[PDB]
Amino acid sequence: PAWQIVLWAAAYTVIVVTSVVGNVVVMWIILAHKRMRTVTNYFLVNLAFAEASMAAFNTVVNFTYAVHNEWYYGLFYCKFHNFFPIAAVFASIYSMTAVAFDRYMAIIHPLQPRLSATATKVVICVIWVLALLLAFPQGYYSTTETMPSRVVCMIEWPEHPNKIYEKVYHICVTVLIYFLPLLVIGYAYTVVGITLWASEGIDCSFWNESYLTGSRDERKKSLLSKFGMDEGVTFMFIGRFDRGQKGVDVLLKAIEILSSKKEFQEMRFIIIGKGDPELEGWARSLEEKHGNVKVITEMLSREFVRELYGSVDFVIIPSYFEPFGLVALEAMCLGAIPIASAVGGLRDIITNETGILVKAGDPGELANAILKALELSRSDLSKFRENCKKRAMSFSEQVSAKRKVVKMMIVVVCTFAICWLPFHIFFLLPYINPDLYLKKFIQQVYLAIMWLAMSSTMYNPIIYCCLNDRFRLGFKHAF
Numbered sequence: 001p002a003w004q005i006v007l008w009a010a011a012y013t014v015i016v017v018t019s020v021v022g023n024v025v026v027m028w029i030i031l032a033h034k035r036m037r038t039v040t041n042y043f044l045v046n047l048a049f050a051e052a053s054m055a056a057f058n059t060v061v062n063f064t065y066a067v068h069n070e071w072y073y074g075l076f077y078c079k080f081h082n083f084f085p086i087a088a089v090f091a092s093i094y095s096m097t098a099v100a101f102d103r104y105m106a107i108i109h110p111l112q113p114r115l116s117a118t119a120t121k122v123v124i125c126v127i128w129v130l131a132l133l134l135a136f137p138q139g140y141y142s143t144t145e146t147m148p149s150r151v152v153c154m155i156e157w158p159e160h161p162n163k164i165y166e167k168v169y170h171i172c173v174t175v176l177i178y179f180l181p182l183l184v185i186g187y188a189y190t191v192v193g194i195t196l197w198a199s200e201g202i203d204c205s206f207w208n209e210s211y212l213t214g215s216r217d218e219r220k221k222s223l224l225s226k227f228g229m230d231e232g233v234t235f236m237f238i239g240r241f242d243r244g245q246k247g248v249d250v251l252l253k254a255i256e257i258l259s260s261k262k263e264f265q266e267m268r269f270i271i272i273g274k275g276d277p278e279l280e281g282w283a284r285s286l287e288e289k290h291g292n293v294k295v296i297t298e299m300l301s302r303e304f305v306r307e308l309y310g311s312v313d314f315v316i317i318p319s320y321f322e323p324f325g326l327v328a329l330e331a332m333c334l335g336a337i338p339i340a341s342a343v344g345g346l347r348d349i350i351t352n353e354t355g356i357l358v359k360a361g362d363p364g365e366l367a368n369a370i371l372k373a374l375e376l377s378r379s380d381l382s383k384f385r386e387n388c389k390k391r392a393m394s395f396s397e398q399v400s401a402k403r404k405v406v407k408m409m410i411v412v413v414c415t416f417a418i419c420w421l422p423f424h425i426f427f428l429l430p431y432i433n434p435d436l437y438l439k440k441f442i443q444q445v446y447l448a449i450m451w452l453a454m455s456s457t458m459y460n461p462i463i464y465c466c467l468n469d470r471f472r473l474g475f476k477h478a479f
């Protein structure tokens with residue numbers, strides 16, 4: 001194959017160059033910047049080290065030697081070249097595994113920051129030793145066996161049939177360096193993905209006080225007038241009427257508590273929702289009975305709900321189960337002060353200076369919180385509402401960042417998942433299924449696959465600057 005010569009020279013050349021340049025600069029960016037030294041990035045340093053700085057430079061040249069059995073330098077490089085890719089890739093993927101579980105803990109169990117700076121260094125050291133210890137039984141025992149034309153090296157022990165032994169060692173390193181750790185990360189990012197991406201999020205353009213006219217006080221005067229009410233402290237509920245999930249039953253209980261008290265004359269309620277006919281009845285029952293209570297069962301314009309949020313003083317969110325708390329956000333963006341049950345996404349979102357938090361299912365604490373809110377309405381709540389808006393927007397952006405980060409890590413894991421699949425199944429095939437040498441395509445495919453698997457090493461540094469801006473601007477600094 002004369003035509004195909006310089007083709008696969010350029011093929012490997014781009015790999016080594018892009019791989020090494022990319023990864024060495026990654027390590028430089030992480031260490032040079034004032035604090036990028038987070039444990040995730042530390043494992044990414046070890047990744048960059050094992051994956052490209054070492055693997056590309058040792059492997060490519062040697063497999064290029066090994067195409068026609070040229071063996072320019074055989075020396076000890078046979079056993080090194082045989083030993084090293086196993087260690088380097090082990091160290092790489094388990095650095096990437098390390099990150100997958102750093103994010104697992106940070107997101108799922110944020111209360112225990114398990115990994116210190118020291119511990120992180122220990123991990124990197126441990127991984128390397130286990131990587132070389134997995135590799136040595138095959139690496140150390142590579143023997144060059146001299147023939148008339150060529151000198152070529154391999155690793156075997158024939159005491160029992162080659163299948164029995166070979167199959168075992170082969171499948172062990174294959175499953176340990178590829179299949180199992182990919183299963184583990186797959187799990188970790190599946191559940192972290194579920195956590196971050198379960199919620200679509202809210203339109204921060206749509207829910208903004210900007211689209212409303214006049215003062216909030218005028219808007220409340222107007223809104224209550226439309227319901228035939230005099231001005232007072234206004235509370236609002238929006239959600240499905242149900243026993244199990246949302247807590248309209250508890251609001252109704254709390255309203256009936258308050259009805260027997262004098263301060264109830266200074267309150268205004270707006271209950272919005274559809275569901276359990278009994279709870280619609282209960283709500284409408286109190287509507288007729290008292291008349292500082294208004295119930296809406298009809299479907300409402302998104303714009304009208306924004307008006308409500310941006311007019312009422314407080315929003316009640318007495319959930320049992322609320323994994324997202326999108327109501328809190330929409331309310332807080334529009335300056336409604338949330339009086340929420342502490343559950344799921346509501347304890348995450350609401351701070352001490354942000355809203356009032358109460359125990360779910362307790363009409364006692366809820367009725368009191370409503371009365372607290374009444375006493376608070378006698379002061380200036382404006383700064384309270386400012387806090388809510390800032391918090392709601394802050395929370396939103398935190399989540400966006402966390403998502404963008406974990407995305408990037410999934411991408412780099414999906415890379416290895418791709419490139420190295422053909423490489424392993426290629427070596428795994430001639431066992432249960434005897435090799436087909438029937439086609440004229442033999443060496444060329446080995447080259448193409450090996451090229452892909454080796455090209456995995458030059459992908460990550462590109463993926464880093466393409467997803468994450470911090471790396472990209474780190475590139476902007478020098479190149």
Ligand SMILES: C[C@@H](O[C@H]1OCCN(Cc2nn[nH]c2CN(C)C)[C@H]1c1ccc(F)cc1)c1cc(C(F)(F)F)cc(C(F)(F)F)c1
Pocket residue numbers: 059081082083084085086087088089090138155166167170173174177423424427428
């Ligand atoms: C695709 C995968 O091959 C290895 O596992 C499958 C069997 N491969 C052939 C092999 N080598 N020694 N013993 C055997 C099995 N025996 C029956 C011939 C493995 C392998 C291939 C090339 C090596 F340098 C080291 C290991 C693999 C290759 C490479 C490398 F070629 F790039 F070096 C590296 C790795 C690893 F990720 F482990 F580093 C795996």
